[PDB]
Amino acid sequence: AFPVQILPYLYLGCAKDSTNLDVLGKYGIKYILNVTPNLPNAFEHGGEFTYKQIPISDHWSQNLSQFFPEAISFIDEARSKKCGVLVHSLAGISRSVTVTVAYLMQKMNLSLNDAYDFVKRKKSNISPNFNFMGQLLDFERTLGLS
User: Which of 9, 66, 7, 5 shows the shortest CA–CA distance to 35?
Assistant: First the structure.
């Protein structure tokens, strides 16, 4: 139905959220972070939207943390001008959740544990793939939060 608001201007969702012009418009979302290699940037052209695509599949072979700096900077670009950004994947449970947790760790200076708890409480169905959680553990070390 509706993407979850994780922080002001920061929304977490699935592919159906990404292709719902009514809901995007309702919540002031004009930035879309498409964390898939294969879903279209549906509304990128000729309109008011700004897209970034992180071409990672929801799969144990994938290195999503290499893209954290690019993803996090794109989210902050939106949020800093009070424009909604939707971080989405196909299901809204793994890739998008991973990027959202990474964002919270860096931007709010949260441990992985505190960031994960925060998101899990707002969206009980989150199911980030085991390799992405391993990569979040590594990213926590690079931030100096462990």
Answer: 66
